[PDB]
Every structure is written in structure tokens, then in C-alpha cells.
Ligand binder design. Structure first.
Ligand SMILES: OCC1(Nc2ncnc3[nH]ccc23)CCCC1
Length: 167
């Protein structure tokens, strides 16, 4: 039993809700919140910009030190950093950005990072400003993640479409 509330159950391990991931994180304080990161951990917009803003830019400061030490992530890769005031940990995961020409096949690799964590609050990878089809992202999530994932979909209209079209 955990403290996630109001989610629709999609499968044994995947749950979905129309919610602002920032507000969800502030309420639940999950062990792991997933950020929709880029390889530079530059948290400018989308989910990443919103999460970083909620940390008063502390996420960005930590991220800049991480990159200065380690260099960029790989598309499809991840790193674990602090969750600041939002969660114990933030798993920064890089899905392919279609608006950059990156290979959508890397979306499965990106979701594989979730399997290293027993429970996660997460957005749909490569959706929104990353330019992939969110219906496809949901399918890859369901077919790749085996741990317990609570998906926050910001856009209510998109949420309804994802539920109604889910196979
Ligand atoms: O889930 C993926 C999407 N992005 C967010 N989800 C949840 N909370 C969010 N807060 C800010 C952005 C954001 C991308 C397109 C629609 C939802």
C-alpha cells in the first residue's frame, strides 16, 4: 500500500491520472519522481522547467555540478540526483526528442531506467515538447516498465484520449 490517490489502474503495475506532476510530488513526496530531462540537464521547459522552478532552481544548480563532473547523459540514459523539496530522489531520464531528430526506438531504452526503482511518479517520456505521440509513449511504458509506475498527465484533454484509446 502507498499514498497515491485517484489513479486509474491500467495494468498490474501502471496507474494513470490527470495531474500536474509538480503538485502531485508536493503532496505525495514519493521516493522517486522522474524528470523528463535532456542530456545537458538544462531544465528550461516542459516537465523539467516546472520541476526545477518548484525547487527554486536548486535542481538546476545540482545538475550543473553533475554535468561539470560527468559530462552529458546519453539519449535513453538517466541519472539519480536529489529530489529536493519534491521527492527523496529525482530520476532524470532522457527520452528521445523528436523535434531534434532523435531515434524514437530509444524510448524503450529510456523507460528501462524505471525498472531500477520499485515505485515511481513519472510523466510520459518523449511526450509534450519532446514531440512524440503520447499514445505510443504510454504503450512503450506499459510494455517495458515492470515496477510500479504512477503516470501524471498534465493535459486533461490528452488524459481522456489516453484512457479511451488504451488497449
Ligand atoms: O506527462 C507528460 C506531459 N507533461 C507534464 N505532465 C505532468 N505534469 C506536468 N507538469 C508540467 C508539465 C507536465 C507532456 C504533455 C502533456 C503531459
Amino acid at each position: 500500500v502507498n499514498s497515491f490517490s485517484g489513479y486509474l489502474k491500467l495494468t498490474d503495475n501502471v496507474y494513470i491520472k490527470n495531474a500536474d506532476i509538480v503538485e502531485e510530488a508536493k503532496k505525495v513526496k514519493p521516493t522517486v519522481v522522474v524528470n523528463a530531462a535532456n542530456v545537458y540537464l538544462k531544465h528550461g521547459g516542459g516537465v523539467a522547467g516546472a520541476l526545477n522552478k518548484a525547487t527554486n532552481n536548486a535542481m538546476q544548480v545540482e545538475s550543473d555540478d553533475y554535468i561539470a563532473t560527468n559530462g552529458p547523459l546519453k539519449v535513453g540514459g538517466s541519472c539519480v540526483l536529489s529530489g529536493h523539496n519534491l521527492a527523496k530522489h529525482c530520476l532524470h531520464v532522457v527520452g528521445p526528442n523528436v523535434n531534434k531528430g532523435e531515434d524514437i526506438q530509444l524510448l524503450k531504452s529510456a523507460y528501462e531506467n524505471f525498472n531500477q526503482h520499485e515505485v515511481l511518479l513519472a510523466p510520459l517520456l518523449s511526450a509534450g515538447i519532446f514531440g512524440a505521440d503520447p499514445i505510443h509513449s504510454l504503450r512503450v511504458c506499459v510494455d517495458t516498465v515492470r515496477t510500479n509506475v504512477y503516470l501524471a498527465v498534465f493535459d486533461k484533454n490528452l488524459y481522456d484520449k489516453l484512457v479511451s484509446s488504451f488497449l
